[PDB]
Design a protein around this ligand. Structure first.
Ligand SMILES: [Mg+2]
Ligand SMILES: [Mg+2]
Ligand SMILES: [Mg+2]
Ligand SMILES: [Mg+2]
Ligand SMILES: [Mg+2]
Ligand SMILES: [Mg+2]
Ligand SMILES: [Mg+2]
Lengths: 257, 257, 254, 255, 257
């Protein structure tokens, strides 16, 4: 799946690519599970090699945040929920070269879907590939913060269910939900931590136009402010787990009596 | 619910609003669950847009501590107990513009109720919107410190139930109380942490008249001194949980024998 | 209960107060659960308002470490054991004004009893209210260190018990007693640490007093880790015990 | 087992040692469980004392990262899996002296096996003992990162077994404990390489090309350690949830 | 028990003290559970008061690391195993005055036993009391590191026993061994931490001849490198404890069925 976008008055407008062959006019090329026809098309029409599937698995800093003849590379976890509502992180390879942004990804993602919807009726400021990359990160953080907000409200309700060792079988259900909330929070943290590394790298490495530099710092500031929330949820979750076992053992005693 | 206050010899005096239409004379407008008639009234009589309900859910720094054409915005958790005696945090949007303070909130709050009572017979120092905002934070901290104090004394009594009782009935009750104290402390910490960010932002961002600056630092100093107490309670609570499970298992053994 | 002390060759000597009315000669006024007659006596004979009972409950820095028209105020937890041998902290309001120290407290305390015993037959150095306040803190830390030392030796014996029966109920109970002592010792230390940090930045402290304060801060820094180390051991012991209890449960069911 | 390597256009080429006696031409001598005949051969043909077996057990900084008349010494944990698929760390003594690298080890290791494969058809940059040492550390980190990646995917599958019987649960706890252990041993390996590289940066004149290489490895380690810590949280939480399910099950049974 | 040592070509040589009365020639006096005859002998022949038994119990910095008319005092935990193979720490009072070292101890200790054995055929460098004190600390650290090394190998074997979660007999034994390894590690950490304070004090306080200063820093560096190992063992130990309880509960279920 190949989509391309060009700029018109600092407004991202969707290029037709099946028909309007010239890719050279695009500021952003976005690939989702691209076949070899699409890869080769980018290779020949632009200068651009793209990362292979196993290179997106690499978690080492030097494999994710690096500069080379193919441009500036940032690989970053993006958060998603699979078909059975199980949280996950999907690595996206960002590449910036000659003022063009390339995003290579394994699947559809809610941040991208959201940014694209907004980009349809919303002006960029400086109108460049670095701004675009950060806009996508802004969007990511916005969603991560929404995830955390919902862990709180779900955990609040679940908390009240757990305050009785009244078991059968709203308690099997409670432990399961706890474990689902732990896992979401855990994966949100990985996503935040990784974006944090990515942005710290960017700040030291890319000439970032100054409007872009402040934007990046703003996102870093948001991340610094979300991480503690994440850590706070783990305490609560772990305590709730402990209390539940207490109630289960109290119940066991009742039963044996 | 719209209340408005004006200043008379550095004394907040309650300006009648059903009758005395001119809002322009107020230093402080306080909204509680305001209907669209009240919102629009503030919009037209002053310049003032107010934050929407879902914008108060946002926990990201950049959504809580920011400056824009509508003025200086500080969103801050305030602590309360709901109708069924469950602790909670309620976000209050503070907005300062052209020397006037706007507080927008979802519900009655004990800090506000308390500050208003006092403000009926008590002089402000410099008599301005920044002082007023900090006075409300001072009051918040005063109450948070009282909460912590009471967690201590409650935990002290509960501690003795957990060493001296072995009935199954007074022990369900004990675990429940433990969990109620854990939750209060947890929510107090969130409240403190958030006020801390808010005040750090204020110190760097607002021209704060120097009398206000020292006031803010005093509040910051109080917070630095309350956070460790919070953390100390969690250790005790967790240890008590562990001891209880030990006693429950010792009891189980007695029963089976 | 009102006691007063005056200085004689840098030696604290106990003033008779039922009889020798002039309080003005005292360097140190010590109140224990004082009635309104004693409070008013301090109010009129010296300039001195004293903190009220509910103000000693306040834990907020700004309510404990502050300066005002009534002088320099330091509120600080002191460690004690109640009638049933249960550990506790009692807040003591220290107030320094015009070279005189005021201590207001809710109860008798071992640090004070100990300092008073010694102060009979022991010379102060610079002989002033700031030294006196720090001398009381020195004594407090001395006793806190003793408490920790004993948690160690008690925990050592208890450790061996934990490696069917009636002696295990007893073990868990003792563990929980030792946890609580250590916990309350830490609160006491942490609070004295804030108090001394405040003092260092705030009071003109005569230089002899400044080094004294730093010495106490250094002691606290060296005791806090011990406290934390005990919690690890205590928590681990608790865990092992539950393991043994479950192993026992399995033996029984078989 | 004695292997020796010399340089030819910045390409490590394997010296024949059974036959081509002169060791003096080697840039890298690599010893695996060397007998006293091999040790003595290094002692006499080069100046080189080698660390004894019990000196590789020593974990103290001053026993692992030090300089003396015998040269520059770096002892470092390398990660491996034994015959029964159990994770382990094996200390390797690196020694650099008069532009020559000596590696002394107790066993075959996957990092070395991998670096040697690659070195057969791959050019070094500056072509020296310090680069060589760092190349081996680079390779080590590459493999540690792969381990962590696999702990994640295994833990993901195991997570679902624990949410979704008595038989498949013994097995689950055992797997959990295998993953904890791997992560634990990876951390020890990372931490130790980190000390080693910090020491190197302050101590050896490191040619500037080497210096950046070392910092790159340090940067990778900084980025892998948090992953390690993150796994321990998940593992510990999974352990707790399992006990919860086991106790719920116990209650069902007793009823 | 009084032993005394003098220097001969930077070689500690054991003075005969029953017979060769002059103690003034010694660089090192070493007391083990000394009676009042030996204490008084040191008091009169040298200037030297020695710390009393209850003064070695004091753990407060100011009671362990201090200077006074009696010289330079360093009290330090040394590690040992008692008659019933239980790990322990024994405080040793080091005192340096007029170029002479005094060590006062409650019992035989493996570091001292080891240093003395080596000192019989090994030259000191600068040949002074400060070097001697540090040599003893070097030896201590050497042994602590050996302890940690052995905790690792014992914990490795024990780890494999605990994955066979089956028999009731080899499991009592396993928990016991775990608890014995936890305790050793715990006491090793106390020993390390205390030596660390002692050496930090020494570095700021004693004129330390420069050869001695580097020696001290080397020991500090070793300690900094051993502490993390200690902390790592606690995580493993705690995790193993948890897994064991899991296997015990699985077994309990099997039994009840
Ligand atoms: Mg949101
Ligand atoms: Mg636990
Ligand atoms: Mg059970
Ligand atoms: Mg209060
Ligand atoms: Mg003492
Ligand atoms: Mg050794
Ligand atoms: Mg790889």
């Amino acid at each position: 799946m190949l989509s391309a976008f060009q700029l018109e008055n600092n407004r991202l407008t969707r290029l037709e690519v099946e028909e309007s062959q010239p890719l050279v006019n695009a500021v952003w090329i976005d690939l989702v599970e691209p076949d070899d026809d699409e890869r080769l098309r980018v290779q020949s029409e632009l200068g651009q090699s793209l990362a292979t599937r196993p290179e997106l698995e690499d978690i080492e800093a030097s494999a994710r945040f690096f500069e080379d003849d193919d441009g500036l590379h940032i690989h970053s976890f993006f958060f998603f929920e699979d078909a059975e509502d199980h949280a996950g992180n999907s690595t996206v390879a960002f590449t910036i070269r000659d003022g063009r942004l390339f995003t290579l990804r394994e699947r559809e993602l809610p941040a991208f879907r959201l940014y694209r919807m907004r980009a349809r009726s919303q002006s960029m400021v400086d109108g460049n590939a670095y701004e675009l990359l950060l806009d996508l990160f802004e969007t990511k953080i916005e969603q991560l913060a929404d995830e955390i907000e919902n862990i709180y409200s779900d955990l609040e309700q679940l908390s009240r269910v757990i305050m009785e060792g009244h078991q059968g079988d709203e308690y099997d259900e409670a432990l399961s939900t706890l474990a689902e909330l732990e896992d979401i929070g855990w994966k949100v943290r990985l996503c935040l931590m990784d974006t944090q590394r990515a942005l710290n790298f960017l700040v030291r490495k890319a000439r970032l136009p100054g409007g872009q530099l402040e934007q990046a710092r703003e996102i870093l500031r948001d991340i610094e402010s979300l991480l503690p929330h994440n850590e706070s949820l783990f305490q609560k979750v772990n305590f709730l787990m402990q209390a539940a076992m207490g109630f289960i053992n109290i119940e066991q005693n009742r039963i044996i009596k």
